Symmetry: C2
Subunit: 464 residues, 2 copies
């Protein structure tokens, strides 16, 4: 397992890598990558490319469901890293340095289509770089000096790591940009981004906060009012805000550079550029959450003040009153802040569902029931922590002239425990620190036995 990285001399991070690790200099990150954002080292698929490997359209994901989002291909879907012709360092970062057959790097054809899914027809199937792995393990991080062909604009490099001891290969497509000469818009500098950060509701609004020579200046501010359910989609209002920004402002434009070096809004992350000589240096995004919010609440009934440790694991029998459409999460912690139980529940408004929690450990002491209340969209609304205790079963009141018939209950003998011995007499366990000897007995080691052991004089005392 491993991914194309740029922690050292690497020229560009892979697409899946940028789903988790911000870019080397621009601090950019790919958006909406699915599960692969947690494990970018896992873009693994059948080997044999290009003859028989991942089928067309599934190259970027290597047919792995975890990385299926990477298979989307448009001119502005992915962060593009700058690259130059000629020799470049391609860096791999491994979490499991498998025995390697070889590495191979393919670049798209000069006139490839970026709005078409990645296919064999899109690439120069003759790799521009091959590194014999030698069927040995590499270091946990390696780099390959590769002669990158001459290109222009948006290109994609496919880095294939052929694992030597499996039938699989790791595929990492890389979104690169061949700029070089002709600096694209030298009079415009990026100072912010419109990330599709969240979905918004009707009544909400998203607006910009431009930072210049005199702090924030609301003359350049743009506000977009979410007036439709479809405009609430993170990609939608990001495109609309960038569009409204370009209508109302002149010293700043929002959107991705297209093939003509013209800033055009996209349905994703829209960078914000600042005109040189305007004094602007940074733009940030803010939100007005003015949509009518229901009065969310959760009521937990049935939590006893004390729970007696019984035969089985202690059990919480609770019921929940849900005010508003909420999503609840409950967890049980003990005296030492250790998790013992959990219960998720996507309740509706007014729904009275039953909850039942089993403690993984039923030990005495202070316990806590943490209750996290979210809405149907997952926003944390409130947290409440209720207290309760677990107690050991109360010993019965003392009765008779002793407590056990030796050796019954040998494990519980403490300072003052009276026992009946085989000689018909009563012996009391001596106090500190001799009470530890009252527990040591076995049919083989019969010392400390009251009336029979050779050393019971130090452990027990005959009662009268």
């Amino acid at each position: 397992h491993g991914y194309v990285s740029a922690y050292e001399n690497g020229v560009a991070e892979g697409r899946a890598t940028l789903c988790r690790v911000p870019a080397n200099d621009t601090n950019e990150k790919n958006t909406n990558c699915g599960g692969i954002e947690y494990e970018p080292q896992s873009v693994e698929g059948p080997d044999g490319f290009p003859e028989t490997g991942p089928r067309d359209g599934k190259i970027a994901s290597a047919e792995n469901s975890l990385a299926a989002a990477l298979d989307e291909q448009t001119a502005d879907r992915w962060v593009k890293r700058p690259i130059q012709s000629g020799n470049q360092h391609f860096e791999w970062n491994f979490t499991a340095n498998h025995i390697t057959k070889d590495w191979k790097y393919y670049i798209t054809k000069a006139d490839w289509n970026p709005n078409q899914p990645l296919a064999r027809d899109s690439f120069d199937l003759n790799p521009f770089c091959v590194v014999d792995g030698g069927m040995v393990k590499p270091p946990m991080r390696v780099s390959h000096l590769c002669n990158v062909p001459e290109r222009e604009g948006y290109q994609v490099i496919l880095a294939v790591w052929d694992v030597g001891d499996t039938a699989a290969s790791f595929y990492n497509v890389i979104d690169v940009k061949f700029d070089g000469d002709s600096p694209v818009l030298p009079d415009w500098n990026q100072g912010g981004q419109i990330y599709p950060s969240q979905d918004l509701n009707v009544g909400d609004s998203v607006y910009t906060r431009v930072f210049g020579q005199n702090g924030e200046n609301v003359s350049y501010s743009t506000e977009l009012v979410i007036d439709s359910e479809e405009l609430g989609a993170a990609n939608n209002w990001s495109h609309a805000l960038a569009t409204k920004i370009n209508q109302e402002q002149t010293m700043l434009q929002a959107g991705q550079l297209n093939a003509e070096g013209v800033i055009s809004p996209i349905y994703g992350t829209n960078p914000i550029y600042l005109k040189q000589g305007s004094g602007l240096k940074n733009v940030e995004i803010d939100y007005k959450i003015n949509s009518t919010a229901p009065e969310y609440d959760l009521e937990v009934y049935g939590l006893e003040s004390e729970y007696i440790i019984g035969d089985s694991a202690t059990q919480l029998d609770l019921t929940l009153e849900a005010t508003g459409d909420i999503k609840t999460e409950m967890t049980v912690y003990n005296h030492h802040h250790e998790s013992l139980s959990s219960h998720s529940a996507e309740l509706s408004d007014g729904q009275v569902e039953a909850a039942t929690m089993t403690l993984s450990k039923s030990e005495p002491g202070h316990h806590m029931l943490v209750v996290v209340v979210k809405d149907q969209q997952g926003k944390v609304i409130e947290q409440n922590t209720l207290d309760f205790h677990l107690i050991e079963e109360q010993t019965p009141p003392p009765s008779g002239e002793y407590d056990f018939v030796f050796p019954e209950g040998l494990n519980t003998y403490t300072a003052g425990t009276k026992v009946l011995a085989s000689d018909g007499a009563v012996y009391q366990c001596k106090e500190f620190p001799f009470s530890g000897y009252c527990t040591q007995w076995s049919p083989s080691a019969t010392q400390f036995e009251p009336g029979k052991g050779s050393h019971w004089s130090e452990a027990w005392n005959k009662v009268n």
Copy 2:
């Protein structure tokens, strides 16, 4: 706008920072932070702490709805960074360096309850560190030397950036771990993590791939079948997989280091530890997904022109068999080659297929 970071001499990143930027050495990240993960520099709220400002239970979010997820407080919700007593360097990374009044740092009381929402009663309101801002703009990245008080175990440091040109401050809680000097579990070393990477469905499964001296060895593998809708929740099968790993394997254990130091599975990110001398090197996680509109789909369509510029869009969450009507208007009706990209996802948002049709005007 800015956040507590550790790009240079910073001793520990802030909680919101770890929602976006991996840890310095451990590569860890906080999970399920909401929209704040895109903009960790935006945890901004009213000033005046602790007399006024963010109310109790909203300190970590500064009452910003964008950062509402940070207000949850349990013993194992957040990634904790090791720290020591005495003088330590705390680093701020600014995206907009506002005129600054001061920076103030507060640390939780020694016997604070990490399962209670963060409140003023949780913190020592006498700040252990105050840095003058001088009502001037700071550099784009600064560090402050602060005398961190002696603590043990899980603590939280609140870093307050009070800017001078607004009535707002930036609040960054920092999850720290006073590990002392005795290394906990020297015969155990982390070699993988179980991230709550996705929700699973009934019939799916999740399993481990244990990399050792001779590649992957399936004798060490553990598999968890998702047999109920509740177990399909990411935090649910993560904890269950970590639990099942501990039942079946002796050379590797899964879970966090609790207050008792033992490896205990949590309902979040579970690191996987490897017994020193076992030969194991790394553990990865894999998934079996064994569970005109054909099927319940969610579609996304976009129009591109000759020069790869977006001109129209149309989302539609169709059902099975539903034949709905679509209407797209081009923002530019110019001659040349055009493309219509059609992205096919499922009701859960997983990309299934993309088709690009060609046409001319």
